[PDB]
């Protein structure tokens, strides 16, 4: 909204730029995690701490 355009002239470039649509477990299945994947590409600064 323009009201949070005005107070997002106050908070941040990345302060309220986000909203939740996280990839979750589908409804009904429930297991455990056995394998995770790591894939990163040279340019844009892998995190630390971490």
């Amino acid at each position: 909204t323009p009201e949070e355009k005005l107070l997002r002239a106050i908070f941040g470039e990345k302060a309220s730029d986000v909203k939740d649509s996280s990839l979750r477990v589908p409804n009904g299945v429930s297991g455990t995690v056995i394998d995770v994947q790591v894939f990163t590409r040279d340019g844009v600064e892998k995190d630390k701490r971490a």
Partner: peptide, 14 residues
């Protein structure tokens, strides 16, 4: 989106 996507394998006891 923002903050990332990772491939995750799930194992369910059938």
């Amino acid at each position: 989106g923002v903050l990332k996507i990772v491939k995750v394998y799930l194992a369910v006891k059938r």
